[PDB]
Design a protein around this ligand. Sequence first.
Ligand SMILES: O=C(N[C@@H]1[C@@H](O)[C@H](O)[C@@H](CO)O[C@H]1O)c1ccccc1
Ligand SMILES: O=C(N[C@@H]1[C@@H](O)[C@H](O)[C@@H](CO)O[C@H]1O)c1ccccc1
Lengths: 367, 367
Amino acid sequence: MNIKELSLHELCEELKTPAWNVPLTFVGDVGGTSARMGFVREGKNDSVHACVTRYSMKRKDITELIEFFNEIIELMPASVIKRVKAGVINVPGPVTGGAVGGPFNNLKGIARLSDYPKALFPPGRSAILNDLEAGGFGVLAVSDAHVFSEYFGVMWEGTQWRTCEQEPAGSVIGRGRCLVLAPGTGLGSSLIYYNPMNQQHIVVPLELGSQTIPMRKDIDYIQTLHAELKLLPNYENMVSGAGLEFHYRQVVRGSRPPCSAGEIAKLASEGDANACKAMKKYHEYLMRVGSEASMALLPLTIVLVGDNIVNNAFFYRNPQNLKEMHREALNHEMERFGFQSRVTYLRQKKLLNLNLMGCYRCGLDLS
Amino acid sequence: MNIKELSLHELCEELKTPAWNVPLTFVGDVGGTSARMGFVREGKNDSVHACVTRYSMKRKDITELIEFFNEIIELMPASVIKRVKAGVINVPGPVTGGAVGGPFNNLKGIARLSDYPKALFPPGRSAILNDLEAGGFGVLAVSDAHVFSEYFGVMWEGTQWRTCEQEPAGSVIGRGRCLVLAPGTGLGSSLIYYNPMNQQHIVVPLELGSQTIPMRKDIDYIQTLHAELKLLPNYENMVSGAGLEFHYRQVVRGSRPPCSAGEIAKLASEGDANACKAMKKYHEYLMRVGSEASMALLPLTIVLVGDNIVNNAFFYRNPQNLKEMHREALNHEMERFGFQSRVTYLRQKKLLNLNLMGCYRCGLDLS
Ligand SMILES: O=C(N[C@@H]1[C@@H](O)[C@H](O)[C@@H](CO)O[C@H]1O)c1ccccc1
Ligand SMILES: O=C(N[C@@H]1[C@@H](O)[C@H](O)[C@@H](CO)O[C@H]1O)c1ccccc1
């Protein structure tokens, strides 16, 4: 279980050594800000081994990837390029047919597998994934490598965990549906479906973030945002970078000027009461995604992923914050039957590119 | 592909015929009112023959099923019971692990597979499905039988259809997600997921009906029902028999007597203005489930199913109601990117026991 971030040239260097004389998978973790592309292999002892290189999404254009791909094929020895098993990338938008990606909230353009160089993407062994589809595959990869409790932590255990599992919560993904939520720049979501027939986990990409927010006792608050956006607020409007910024503006009331999502997270990490208020308000809405999806999708577990989640551990390790999220996760009419209480909430507690692992885990299936 | 209801006694006679020496699958369709149970064999020319018998759910308790099971085997040749290779039943409520079902709105008790006679339910070859889970399996079976266009009509074709498929809308299930909705007494919902990299369909049970309804311009209407229920309304509150009655009361305001949904639908078929206005309100909220799920679950198709939908066909043939349902289905902020327009809507136009044939279908996957 390991990745090494390299410059484009040292990447080329490493790929000629003895350990890399093995079959290889091309992977790309593409975001609205950067792309991470490179190769993956195994040694022995279930060993997950990757090295990639960062790219900036300069043009803010998903089609820029084609230029990166070419650059990689020529600038590298085809003795390596011929060891390429499969080609899997993920992108931050809806993807249909594993072949077409778009439209994107961040970038312009359309991701097209058919316009991809077949050296990095062998036909019949290539996919374009949604970013949270990739990450879903990554959660599965982490589980299979028996290393779950190294990367995820229980926030609170739900009723049903012990009905399905004797091992401790957080030690395994569990034999039930796992809902993956990635509250970052945008709000990502996938359902790791579990087929009780053959005991298989199956990643199902979702767009929960774009659902219109249903109310609690917060009609005035929603209407305030409604009036700024000129749009019925969806979950992502509250749970996102722009949402966090909004939460901050509502807290301060002109008393401090607006600052960025990033700045608000840093502030709260220093005990700023205003930013902390904003962080809680953000999490109140994340939890509403959880409780509605708890009913609709019936998960055994809910997992919060992303570097965002790892880095804000100051917020999660506070028991008053945890208790309030928990309160909001149970704030649903159906809780009078225990449905939201059934569910176990975890969060990623250690850095790991789930998407790259997932692209690789996905490539094994296309193989 | 074809069934026959028989008295318990004569069903027992039927199985003794040499054409029923085939391997058999025990199936069972359980609703709040009654339960139909029987056996399915396969025949000449890939034919599928089922014959079943009926049962009143008198105590309104799901455990009552065990009696019928026992009674089945006791008043039945153990010569023919030996032929049972698979047993599958559906029940009208949530189910975990294909083995534990409940509790149910319309019945009391808990369906447990472990309490069932292994003569009918052979371990490792048996399951409990949710009713829409079975329906989903049924919808798959109708498609593979090449008889889709016979039982389903296109309400309107969506944008993605001719891109993903080559055959006409309504003639196959399609290689894409299919959301099945059963707006009846309860609101049923399942998602027939499509894995684009093994070309395969998988049935994922859902409880969409219990999500809190997000607003449109209907804050007052929602507050009204809210006060009547002393519960935040969920979609099933607006879309159900109880919901249809409620819509009819808000129409007449006391000017005419209250009446059952069944009689409201009858009244609309005859052309009562009040009834037709209730029917439209009901459908306005049914379309909202669709609009919200279209975004959240990214389906290629949405299919309305059940005896209900066939019987109240009149409502769907009227091009005026259709253009209004279609308008409500596109009533979503995300439609500015064409997401609601993507989806093709279909209705069941001919009677069929999706659930019974769903049980058999599931049974085949289990062998
Ligand atoms: O971009 C969209 N949704 C994206 C998701 O695909 C992604 O999982 C998430 C995290 O990166 O950011 C969201 O903004 C999107 C586009 C069009 C319609 C609805 C949603
Ligand atoms: O009964 C429930 N849900 C049922 C569904 O499972 C069923 O598919 C549908 C059609 O029969 O009617 C709903 O009312 C139910 C019970 C408890 C919690 C959530 C849902």
